[PDB]
Design an enzyme around this catalytic site. Structure first.
Site, mmCIF file in Angstrom:
data_model
loop_
_atom_site.group_PDB
_atom_site.id
_atom_site.type_symbol
_atom_site.label_atom_id
_atom_site.label_comp_id
_atom_site.label_asym_id
_atom_site.label_seq_id
_atom_site.Cartn_x
_atom_site.Cartn_y
_atom_site.Cartn_z
ATOM 1 N N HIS A 156 39.353 55.016 29.474
ATOM 2 C CA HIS A 156 38.653 55.869 28.837
ATOM 3 C C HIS A 156 38.265 55.184 27.026
ATOM 4 C CE1 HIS A 156 37.852 59.793 26.706
ATOM 5 N NE2 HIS A 156 38.510 59.375 25.620
ATOM 6 N N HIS B 96 34.601 54.934 24.646
ATOM 7 C CA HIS B 96 34.447 54.937 23.200
ATOM 8 C C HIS B 96 33.900 53.893 22.760
ATOM 9 C CE1 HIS B 96 36.386 58.829 21.797
ATOM 10 N NE2 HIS B 96 37.178 58.705 22.936
ATOM 11 N N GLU C 36 33.484 63.022 21.903
ATOM 12 C CA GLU C 36 34.034 63.209 23.207
ATOM 13 C C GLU C 36 33.116 63.622 24.472
ATOM 14 O OE1 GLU C 36 37.984 62.829 22.675
ATOM 15 O OE2 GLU C 36 37.083 61.362 24.115
ATOM 16 N N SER D 288 33.519 58.030 30.738
ATOM 17 C CA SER D 288 34.714 57.520 31.476
ATOM 18 C C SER D 288 35.151 58.270 32.534
ATOM 19 C CB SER D 288 35.845 57.380 30.238
ATOM 20 O OG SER D 288 36.324 58.756 29.700
#
Ligand SMILES: O=S(=O)(O)CCN1CCN(CCS(=O)(=O)O)CC1
Ligand SMILES: O=S(=O)(O)CCN1CCN(CCS(=O)(=O)O)CC1
Ligand SMILES: C[C@H](O)[C@H](O)C1=Nc2c(nc(N)[nH]c2=O)NC1
Ligand SMILES: C[C@H](O)[C@H](O)C1=Nc2c(nc(N)[nH]c2=O)NC1
Ligand SMILES: [Fe+3]
Ligand SMILES: [Fe+3]
Lengths: 391, 400
Positions: free
Chosen positions: B259, B264, B304, B323
């Site tokens: 993730h 990110h 997010e 992700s």
């Protein structure tokens, strides 16, 4: 002793050449040990391009293997701009690109020369600058009783003169150095503490240096807001004067001004101008540096005071600049840059800066026509040099 | 467990109060059990003034000892302002002042560390638990300034990465916002992105620093919303170093390294996104608990699970989308509602954490989002305004 070369080029995302370019870059990275670093980054100009950087390191000057690398590289379909450390003008001057690249300078460098004890001691302290790497904590020196005694005499002597003779920025910051960095007659401050304090005031850092660097190396460090400082102290026999930079000069002379934001910008400006500058332009900057950072005066109303590190750390110099036999002139880098100066006597001539932001602007204007293949800029968020293809 | 308090005040050079003030500070420096630091700095607002900063830690909340310090200090002739970690509102909320003060967060976890839920697929895997313990310890002991320790990932760890990597890689060109496609080849070229290899945080951090000034800190697990968001104000992303359990490669409720690295990192190397993300961070600095919650919701619906618009098409920039194969294959369909992003609208919106989003927000650009977030931050009741100093890497407080 090694000679560094850097090769720059750019290429667009989705190019037909990227595949072969990348593959070539892999082979040389593996099978050429003169290559120390190949990196790609987003372009600062074309928001759809990639900038590439190839760093090479050779044992001899103007090594012709570089031309071989350039040819194989440009054969894959890119135009290369090469910079090099050299006496020739075949390529424009190389410069350190990141603050960690200043590590490359670490090994590039009298009253007590007739003293073996003092000479061995100097050798031991210099070892520490020799091995220091960016990122390390700056090792602390256990100074001797004698060395501390010498500091105390200089400290107490200069302290008597600062209030009437130093520029107000110096008087302003000194008590903060006392309160946060252990400045006292009884204690020699450690560079690691001073560097932490400077960072938190203006982003400036210190690294230990063995001795004198070349003008180019020293000035290039300023571009990253990095000041190279000696850790040794002058010989005990002649306390009130020394021809060289010792820790008294660094800590009582240079450091306080570096905690003033406008001065800090001005000093960096001189550094930025030096990045990639020709040898003749480095010499002009060095002289400007002498007449400001080293021996400059400020104007405070109807009064003239000292901010130059070479004055602030010398009782004789501070007790000289106010006399009428010493000429004063308004600072102007076009006038100063070409002025001769003595290194073993008091200055016959001082230049007076109005304000540090003005000095910064003057230097930037002065440097604006410096011939360079790239435009050099500093980015405070990335803490790095930005290199623009606009020339 | 401890609660932080910060006291600050100013005083002019040459004040005849300075001598007695320094004497008083020396006394508490030696005799006050809760004092952790006393520092003085040039004022950033008045060229003739000094700023003093006293930091304290108390074992209990609303510790009445701080008031005695304020009383004693103000007897010396200065006017103190106090910030405090508390659910009380006697004082304005504390925040870390210097980038290195994020070290204070290193042990403030919470969930998704070495304490797992019983439904976690690796909860009764003893090898995995020892591995999570080991990796958490690294974050626990990490100090600002350290190089981030490199993990020797196992071949089963690398296998799991590769499954996720390969599955995601196919969807990026068609589903991700163009900033992703732009940056990803540079991640391959400079940071070791491939399916055969898990990238090391130290390499990513170096890359991000040179691109946008963002850096990585290893984190044990989930931080509180305030701590995490405060870290963003410094352009510091807290990222985990562990990988999800091998038994369920295509899904995890935790922020594991797949993730962090695939969702990110790519967006943080884009200057406008990076500025947008910091703006959220800055908004959180000294924000009320209620406003931290609003910011958290804004974060969810942007960093997010945010979408961008590109012409007639919608693409994903949200890390939780990038992700997750499932999420990538969900947002494009008409099965989810799309709305224009607006922090004054989006902040009150509810959302599921254990299913795909029924609703996503589209940002026009990261510049507009940033500007929107600054409007939002300004609408908060804050007792002062703050700004970031990239040279000193410090928060500066300004008077309102
Ligand atoms: O000293 S500190 O580190 O605290 C702030 C240094 N910083 C350098 C950049 N200038 C303005 C650039 S200019 O566009 O006006 O030239 C503001 C001051
Ligand atoms: O990521 S990069 O380092 O390439 C550029 C980041 N940098 C951040 C700061 N803003 C202005 C501050 S603000 O006052 O407009 O908020 C300009 C862009
Ligand atoms: C360039 C500057 O004007 C001057 O020539 C130099 N100063 C110094 C230097 N090197 C060190 N270590 N310290 C200095 O002050 N190199 C040269
Ligand atoms: C703020 C954000 O919406 C969310 O509540 C949080 N995310 C994270 C967190 N902590 C960590 N380590 N990583 C996150 O992504 N705590 C808070
Ligand atoms: Fe000097
Ligand atoms: Fe996340």
């Amino acid at each position: 002793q090694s000679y560094h070369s850097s090769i720059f080029f750019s290429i667009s995302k989705g190019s037909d050449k990227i595949g072969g370019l990348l593959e070539y870059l892999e082979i040389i990275k593996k099978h050429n040990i003169n290559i120390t670093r190949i990196e790609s980054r987003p372009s600062k100009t074309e928001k759809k391009d990639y900038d590439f950087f190839l760093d090479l390191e050779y044992p001899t000057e103007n090594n012709k293997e570089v031309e071989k690398v350039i040819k194989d590289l440009e054969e894959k379909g890119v135009k290369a701009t090469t910079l090099q450390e050299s006496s020739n003008q075949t390529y424009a001057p190389w410069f350190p690109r990141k603050i960690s690249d200043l590590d490359l300078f670490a090994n590039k460098v009298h009253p007590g020369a007739s003293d073996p004890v003092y000479r061995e001691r100097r050798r031991e302290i210099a070892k520490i600058a020799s091995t220091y790497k960016h990122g390390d904590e700056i090792p602390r020196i256990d100074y001797t009783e004698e060395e501390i005694k010498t500091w105390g005499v200089v400290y107490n002597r200069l302290k008597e003169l600062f209030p009437t003779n130093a520029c107000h920025q110096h008087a302003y910051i000194f008590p903060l150095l006392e309160q946060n960095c252990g400045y006292s007659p009884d204690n020699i401050p450690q560079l690691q503490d001073i560097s932490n304090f400077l960072q938190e005031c203006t982003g400036w850092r210190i690294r230990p240096v063995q001795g004198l660097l070349s003008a180019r190396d020293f000035l290039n460090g300023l571009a990253f807001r990095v000041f190279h400082a000696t850790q040794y102290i002058r010989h005990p026999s002649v306390p009130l004067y020394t021809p060289e930079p010792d820790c008294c000069h660094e800590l009582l002379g240079h450091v306080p001004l570096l905690a003033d934001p406008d001065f800090a910008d001005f000093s960096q400006e001189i550094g930025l101008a030096s990045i990639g500058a020709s040898d003749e332009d480095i010499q002009l900057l060095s002289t400007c540096y002498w007449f400001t950072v080293e021996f400059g005066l400020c104007k405070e109303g109807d009064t003239i005071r000292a901010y130059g590190a070479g004055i602030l750390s010398s009782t004789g110099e501070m007790e000289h600049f106010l006399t009428d036999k010493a000429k004063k002139l308004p600072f102007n880098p076009f006038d100063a840059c070409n002025t001769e100066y003595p290194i073993t006597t008091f200055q016959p001539l001082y230049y007076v800066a109005e304000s540090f932001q003005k000095a910064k602007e003057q230097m930037r204007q002065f440097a604006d026509s410096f011939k360079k293949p790239f435009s050099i800029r500093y980015n405070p968020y990335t803490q790095s040099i930005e290199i623009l293809d606009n020339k």
